[PDB]
Amino acid sequence: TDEFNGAQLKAVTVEAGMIALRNGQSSVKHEDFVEGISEVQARKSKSVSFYA
Amino acid sequence: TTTLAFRFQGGIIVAVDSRATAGNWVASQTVKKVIEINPFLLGTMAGGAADCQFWETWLGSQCRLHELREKERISVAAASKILSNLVYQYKGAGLSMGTMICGYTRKEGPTIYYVDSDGTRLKGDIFCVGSGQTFAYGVLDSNYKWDLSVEDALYLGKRSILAAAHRDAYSGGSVNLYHVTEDGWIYHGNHDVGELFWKVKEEEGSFNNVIG
Amino acid sequence: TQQPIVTGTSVISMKYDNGVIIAADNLGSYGSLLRFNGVERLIPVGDNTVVGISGDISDMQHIERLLKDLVTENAYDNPLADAEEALEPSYIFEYLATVMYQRRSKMNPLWNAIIVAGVQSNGDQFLRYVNLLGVTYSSPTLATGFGAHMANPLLRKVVDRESDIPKTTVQVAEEAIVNAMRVLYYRDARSSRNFSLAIIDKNTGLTFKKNLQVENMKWDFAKDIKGYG
Amino acid sequence: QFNPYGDNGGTILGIAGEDFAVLAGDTRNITDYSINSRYEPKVFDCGDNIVMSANGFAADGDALVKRFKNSVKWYHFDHNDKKLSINSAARNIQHLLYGKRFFPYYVHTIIAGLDEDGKGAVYSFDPVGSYEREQCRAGGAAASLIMPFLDNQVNFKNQYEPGTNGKVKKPLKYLSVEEVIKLVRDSFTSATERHIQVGDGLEILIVTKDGVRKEFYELKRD
Amino acid sequence: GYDLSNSVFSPDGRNFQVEYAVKAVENGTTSIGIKCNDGVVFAVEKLITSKLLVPQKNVKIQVVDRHIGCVYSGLIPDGRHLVNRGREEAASFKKLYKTPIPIPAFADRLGQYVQAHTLYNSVRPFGVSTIFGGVDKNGAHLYMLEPSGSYWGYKGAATGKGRQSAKAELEKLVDHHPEGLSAREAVKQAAKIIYLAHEDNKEKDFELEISWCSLSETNGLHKFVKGDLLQEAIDFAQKEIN
Amino acid sequence: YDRALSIFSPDGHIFQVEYALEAVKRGTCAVGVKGKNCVVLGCERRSTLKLQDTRITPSKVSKIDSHVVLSFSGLNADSRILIEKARVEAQSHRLTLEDPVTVEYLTRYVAGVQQRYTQSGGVRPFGVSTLIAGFDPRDDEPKLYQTEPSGIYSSWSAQTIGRNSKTVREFLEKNYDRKEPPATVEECVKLTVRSLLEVVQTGAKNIEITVVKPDSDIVALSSEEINQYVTQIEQEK
Amino acid sequence: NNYDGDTVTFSPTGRLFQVEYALEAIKQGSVTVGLRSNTHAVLVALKRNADELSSYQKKIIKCDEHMGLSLAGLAPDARVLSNYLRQQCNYSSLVFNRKLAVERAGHLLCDKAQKNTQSYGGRPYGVGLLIIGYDKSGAHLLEFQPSGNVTELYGTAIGARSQGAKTYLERTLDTFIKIDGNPDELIKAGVEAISQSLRDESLTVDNLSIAIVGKDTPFTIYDGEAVAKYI
Amino acid sequence: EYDRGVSTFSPEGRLFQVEYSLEAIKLGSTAIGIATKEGVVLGVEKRATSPLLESDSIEKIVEIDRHIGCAMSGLTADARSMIEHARTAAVTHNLYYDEDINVESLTQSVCDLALRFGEGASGEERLMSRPFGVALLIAGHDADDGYQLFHAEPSGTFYRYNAKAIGSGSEGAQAELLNEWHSSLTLKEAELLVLKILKQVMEEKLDENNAQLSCITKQDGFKIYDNEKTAELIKELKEKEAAE
Amino acid sequence: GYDRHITIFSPEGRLYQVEYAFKATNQTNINSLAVRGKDCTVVISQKKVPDKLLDPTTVSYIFCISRTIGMVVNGPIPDARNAALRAKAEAAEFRYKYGYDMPCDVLAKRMANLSQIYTQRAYMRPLGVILTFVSVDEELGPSIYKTDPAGYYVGYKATATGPKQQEITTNLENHFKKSKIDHINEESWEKVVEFAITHMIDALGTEFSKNDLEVGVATKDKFFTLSAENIEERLVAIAEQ
């Protein structure tokens, strides 16, 4: 994470535990937090048009 | 050097030489005095080699930007008078040019214009341009008639360049014959002037100054 | 249009197995009148290349500064390769060549002859040629001015071509250079006693020995020319 | 006075085969009566099995090697790995030539390579522009000495079939890459004794789609 | 309003855009300039952001002429543009007056250039401070040039995050030697106050770079401090801070 | 200067092109109907006003070429600039290519004037749409084109621009067939008079009719001629 | 909104926000991971198609026979920068008879971006280039930010999920630097590097695009079944 | 806000005026382009707005050169600028090299033109203040890659496709194309395919006064199918849709 | 709107952008005092340096624009340098085209005209410096012309500049009231320095040092500055008055 305050950091953590919920896990794994970072960011984009 | 075009009934016959010398030395015998401006227009190569050939490649560019832009096939008058104003821009830049643009349209008919280096453009029905235009003229214009057949017209193009080749030094090499129709020019191939000589000495009975 | 103003003449040069010897007269000619003496024209650029120039001093001096500024550019950035792999004779040759080419375009030329000679950081000898025309060739011996048809023939005995270089060494080269500089002093009116001799060796680098004199000149047969009467 | 052009001599010879091409020339470079160099080809590979020589003046003739080799690069870049054809090469050059015509080049330029049918193609340029295909073309300061012999051995110029006595002309006979080695050496051998811009070395470059082969032969010192 | 551009102005004397631009320099790398007797000794804190980096292969020290070190902080592209400009100015002086540009003369030209961008809204002000000096014919000098277009002589200067620590010890360095100190000794003192100014950057790790232009050692040429001498400086600074 | 007076909008438009078309709507109505032997451009004049000398007052139809006529709707200031550039271009074609311009060539040319200022900044587009009509040399084919300030052009069998263009166009759906144009010159002329008599009305004062007949024959039918045509239509109706 | 629409301003924090916006082109963009030894440099880019009918977009541009750049942001911007490097490469050949050094060419590229960031109506270039090449100082790997700044590394990445790739390269860091003269190993490790940049995007031989330049290898782009020697 | 500039971003991270231009292609009538390795067919919806319209001298089919064809969709005022430049580009290559230009190479040249917006950005001569609002389907044939079909954006970016439809019916057309395209489609089976897909997105009756066909073949060059032949094929669609 | 953000007129008819320039020249807190002698013109100015790590010798505000004409600057040093550069260029130019060096009067007028042009342009910011030009001309004698950021200038008997300059005015006014002439009747230039220092101490209440002073003297046909050693001789000479 870079340039993140508690409000931004909090969104990652909660969001990690919804991937955990869907997956049907009982323990939240490291990767999930790592995946949770990229949803608060500017991407959820895997789009191609002219900025890929 | 000698380049001629004459209108008749089937269109225009272009006949040119191919010996393009350097001076006292004959640089090449293979130099083609035909310049394919596109499939429907022909340009002769007379004057300086470089200049005359070059800008009629760029005339084909202006041919294809006529075709595109107007969605029509270019008038002969339109082609000729493009090249004309261009060489006026270069008039006293020392570049030399003499070409007969030959074309046959359905909205102007067969038409020759002889465009020249000075910004002179002349409409016309027969021209002969070159070092040896005078020699070729004599044969052609005696036996000239507007009513004429394709065979006779072809044989007169061969014979006229042949006469130039005989007397003038810078003519010779090879002939290339085109028969301009409205569907385009038909190529009638390359004939060497040195094989052509001995056929014509036998068949006409001409060239009686040559000892044989 | 250019008119030659102050001119200098004669640089000779030859290869040998491990390096080159390039040497020049020093004297500013101004035609038959001679106005400068001891004018250097071996301009060292880098520390393993001498660029040996003849023709106009003015043009030589204006590109003398530009030659120092290439080294300045090379030392801008690349702390690992500010002369080690950013300077070789082949680069210094090309830099010079396109400036003279562009001025021949103008019609307002740099009126010079130029030898660029040195040893590369590949470790291989270098000897190329450029001028106000802006022709370019490589060679095994090379020269300028009056020595491009006097001295240069004497050196062509010594090294015939690019496979006679290992048959030539620095003592045999040294002599050949001495001889050549002596010969130039006799038959040229524009060559003097001072000459500076630079050897660029790959085992000892740029050894630039300055202000050598002509020695063992013969002028003792001069009495045995008599009059015509 | 400053004179903006000169010469440097040299003699080149480009021969088109029936499946090979050969662009050769001497490696002697001169100015007036000084031999500048005994060794120095102007016959540069340029990429894409095209070999170029712009022979005559050396200052111009290096200008066209530069800009042409720039065009090779930029063709691949701007036509995305489309190879420069023999045809493509000829016309590009024309444009470079024509581009200085009021301050014209003073070289005789030649390219050689094979065409797309796998036969030789030789184009040869006048100093200011246009080109026409050849099958034999000499150029350089000794052009007119090697040229009329190459026409008598390739194109069979002024030869007739024996015992016909000029009734039947002499037709073409398909050539060999070895065979053309013999023609080129015998001509430049004549060239060394009968012209003075010729000697020291000869380098024949043979070009096919099977490689570019170099051959260095030494000549006579004068 | 009066903060939209740089040729808006306010009754407060502030120009806003320019003051804002100094904040980039104040969050730049620590860089120092020590005025010595024989020359100047520059040193710059080079942050090591990752183990992936190649050490001593990225520089913020570019030479101008053959005798002017220049080291800058703030926005690296912008500073590299300012140094690029001043390499031309040095070449121009050398062309016209046939001498390597004097350090006071070099400062004058740069100040004009930086002035121009605060007088027009159609170009953007600069946000870098450069520290440059060397050895010329009028002696050794040291200048720091603010993005405002202001410069002065300096007996010590600093910029970047760790400027507080550096300056405080530069006062003590001038109180150690009020009659000035050797360039050679100043290598070890430049090391020491970069190490103390890395206590403002102790969440980070660093590489010590030192460069000099001094008459005594480098003969008035700007060179880099490297090898065993560089390592000696590191060992010196290490023991002092321990 | 290059500060945008044309800039892309979040609607996929430029605002000023939309505005330009409303400027042509407020303009006077020009109708174009082509026969099998003529083109007819009749236009609404604002010659209702008294103390006006119409001899020296600009017409709403200006010939650009011997066989190419141009009518316009929108601003009258803007239109004259297009008419001057068009004429200069026409004589250039005669100079370098010979022959007068084709109608299609002029249609493209006026369109290209609008096009340039749509894309570039520091310039606004014109608020003027044209009906360019005529014949080509050695052609008896009537040509009727419409160009608009967008930079687009379209050919039409019949068309109308200016105020109440929808109303006239609706009338022309029943009074004009794509298959069958007006057979004669006179029925084409009376059809254009008939279309004008819907909105324009008010005698032959404000009604103008210009007829171009094949290969450079331009005649303008005076108010007296128009009055006769009006009376016949009125009586018949 | 007074510093986020203009390119000629600061910005109370000493920034320009247009540059930060240009760095979001990298996040949303495609990924490429570069790693070098000392004897070979390697760019391994993940190509991305629009749809099945659509082709895959080449993310590596050959700039020279010893130089190549790869995009990870704005495509129109890459066409400006690619041409500019080629122009300067030919300038080096012409003037100094020399290849254009990778180190030098980064500094030129830097200042070219800078003067459009200065000017009003300008733009920062949102493309991020990774520029490899082999010069006279060995292999080089440069990372070009939207800022214009060039940095030198033995392994880097830009694009989406760059962090996973850099973790992989930091572990294997002293393995791959001390493998030299074997381009194959470096390439295989770059396929594995960019397998950490996935998030169920998979890897196939029509998504994998490798290009290398060596001491004795020119710039060459492997694709098709020439990347099936590593898958 | 983020479009008042002449080139400005965008908290998303990609240029804003360009984004609008891509969503202005949809405004234009449908242009379909189906490429096979037996030739490429381009079909277009001409649009008829009145029976007073003369629609047979209106088309969105334009010849770039003999061996390259183009279909344009979007705002067609913008495409007038682009088509002129394209024609010049093609001619330039045959002037300079006496050679036919690649389809890829031509597309790339028109992409270079498309980026020319801004009035203070880059080193190039700027002559737009805003990007073009038109997308092209450049079809063609080169002898180095056979038949090719490219989709060129107003962005200045290009993708090679095997079938792409743009315009109003872009989404509903392309839904079919993903499943229905394969490489064993011949030129004539492609030709009837165009008309079937065009019928679904046709907002009128399918007929030849609101549809125009064109091919690009190596053998016959760029030929625009006359309305007689176009009409014939349309009637043969309605028979084969009753063969279901 | 923009009647205070650029140099356009307001409903008041007063240019607010221009006013702001004068509200930045007194924020550097440098005072100057300039007096005309009987054969010289002397200008002394503050040179407060509060740092150990700034070299005080290079901190200066007296720039020699001609060999005879000094210029003392009150206000920001970027704008000072730009105005100095421009003035030097013009003074040289005047020699070149008119065959004699630029007068003090006309050099003042030239910078004055450029200042107006900089407030005519709406994208150009004026140089926010008050420039005092001291000389001894041979056609105007001992002279002071003081230009200001707007583009107004006039001659002076004596003048002061800075925030505390009103106090300086009081001293000067008394001096020329009693003498009943426009200059100091003192025939030694050194003693005009001594006098100037005395009135600076009187006005501001501040006791000066040699490193708080910087002195420029235009005598006839040359301009020089005193070094801190020479200024110390003057400070000792106050005790001998």
Side-chain angles (χ1 to χ4, degrees), chain E residues 52-54, chain G residues 35-38 141 153-156 173 176-177:
Chain E
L52 303 171
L53 300 177
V54 186
Chain G
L35 70 168
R36 64 175 185 92
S37 43
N38 295 298
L141 173 62
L153 302 94
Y154 290 115
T156 196
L173 186 61
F176 61 69
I177 296 168

Side-chain angles (χ1 to χ4, degrees), chain F residues 170-184:
Chain F
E170 191 175 63
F171 174 87
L172 287 164
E173 292 176 359
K174 303 300 187 298
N175 284 256
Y176 187 92
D177 189 5
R178 191 175 182 170
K179 299 174 176 177
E180 295 298 299
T184 57

Side-chain angles (χ1 to χ4, degrees), chain G residues 7-19:
Chain G
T7 52
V8 71
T9 54
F10 296 88
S11 190
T13 48
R15 294 181 180 183
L16 178 60
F17 293 108
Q18 301 269 235
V19 184

Side-chain angles (χ1 to χ4, degrees), chain F residues 32-232:
Chain F
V33 183
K34 73 194 190 188
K36 301 180 184 176
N37 45 23
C38 52
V39 292
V40 182
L41 297 175
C43 194
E44 174 179 61
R45 206 172 190 168
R46 296 190 184 187
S47 54
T48 307
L49 313 177
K50 305 184 184 66
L51 310 167
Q52 192 177 316
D53 187 56
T54 53
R55 297 181 292 129
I56 61 181
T57 293
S59 297
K60 306 299 179 294
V61 177
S62 295
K63 61 182 294 184
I64 306 301
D65 193 74
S66 303
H67 49 42
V68 189
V69 286
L70 184 150
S71 187
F72 53 90
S73 298
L75 295 85
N76 288 3
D78 290 11
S79 59
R80 300 175 302 107
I81 315 300
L82 307 177
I83 287 166
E84 286 170 62
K85 285 181 170 183
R87 285 193 58 84
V88 174
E89 188 59 62
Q91 298 302 116
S92 297
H93 188 286
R94 301 182 178 193
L95 182 62
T96 53
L97 299 169
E98 305 189 296
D99 303 294
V101 290
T102 55
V103 185
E104 191 175 1
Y105 183 89
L106 204 74
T107 304
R108 281 183 280 114
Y109 182 67
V110 177
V113 171
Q114 311 302 288
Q115 185 191 134
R116 177 76 289 211
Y117 304 129
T118 303
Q119 58 189 117
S120 299
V123 279
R124 56 169 180 81
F126 303 92
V128 171
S129 178
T130 54
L131 293 171
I132 299 173
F135 292 83
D136 308 303
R138 298 152 290 182
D139 289 74
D140 58 289
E141 285 64 64
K143 294 295 191 178
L144 178 62
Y145 287 91
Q146 185 264 13
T147 302
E148 57 178 299
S150 301
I152 310 178
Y153 60 91
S154 290
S155 193
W156 295 80
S157 308
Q159 173 58 357
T160 175
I161 52 171
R163 60 178 66 170
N164 300 292
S165 53
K166 196 72 70 177
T167 308
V168 176
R169 187 180 299 166
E170 191 175 63
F171 174 87
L172 287 164
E173 292 176 359
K174 303 300 187 298
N175 284 256
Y176 187 92
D177 189 5
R178 191 175 182 170
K179 299 174 176 177
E180 295 298 299
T184 57
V185 180
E186 302 303 298
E187 292 299 297
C188 196
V189 164
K190 288 186 178 64
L191 178 53
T192 305
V193 169
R194 201 172 300 114
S195 296
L196 291 164
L197 284 168
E198 297 177 72
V199 185
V200 187
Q201 303 171 101
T202 319
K205 182 177 291 180
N206 301 116
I207 298 179
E208 300 179 72
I209 296 293
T210 304
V211 185
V212 183
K213 299 170 184 176
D215 307 306
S216 306
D217 288 67
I218 304 184
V219 288
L221 302 177
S222 57
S223 300
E224 302 88 70
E225 310 304 297
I226 302 172
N227 286 121
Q228 297 171 250
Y229 305 144
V230 170
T231 54
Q232 288 171 271

Side-chain angles (χ1 to χ4, degrees), chain B residues 21-161:
Chain B
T21 60
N24 200 252
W25 158 242
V26 175
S28 291
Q29 294 276 84
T30 63
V31 167
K32 305 264 189 282
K33 305 185 171 284
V34 170
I35 304 168
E36 289 176 53
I37 297 182
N38 78 302
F40 293 125
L41 304 156
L42 290 190
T44 63
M45 189 205 308
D51 314 318
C52 192
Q53 205 272 30
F54 183 78
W55 294 126
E56 299 177 63
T57 310
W58 170 83
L59 194 70
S61 296
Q62 302 323 312
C63 170
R64 192 61 67 181
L65 288 164
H66 194 87
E67 206 272 295
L68 289 159
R69 281 289 160 95
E70 309 298 297
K71 301 287 171 187
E72 299 165 68
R73 195 207 295 175
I74 194 164
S75 287
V76 210
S80 47
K81 197 169 209 171
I82 292 163
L83 192 53
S84 191
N85 295 109
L86 199 69
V87 299
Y88 193 60
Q89 181 54 243
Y90 311 126
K91 194 189 169 172
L95 308 172
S96 192
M97 168 73 59
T99 178
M100 286 69 92
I101 292 166
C102 298
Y104 192 162
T105 48
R106 54 204 168 290
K107 55 170 278 197
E108 204 171 7
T111 326
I112 317 162
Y113 285 81
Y114 162 58
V115 185
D116 182 53
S117 63
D118 273 66
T120 328
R121 194 189 49 145
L122 301 175
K123 39 185 274 191
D125 285 58
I126 306 166
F127 298 93
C128 191
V129 169
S131 61
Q133 61 198 358
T134 50
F135 313 108
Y137 272 140
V139 183
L140 187 65
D141 304 1
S142 297
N143 305 333
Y144 182 55
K145 183 177 197 297
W146 163 233
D147 288 286
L148 206 58
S149 307
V150 180
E151 178 52 48
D152 292 75
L154 287 158
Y155 182 61
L156 204 73
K158 293 169 213 163
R159 185 65 187 91
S160 289
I161 302 306

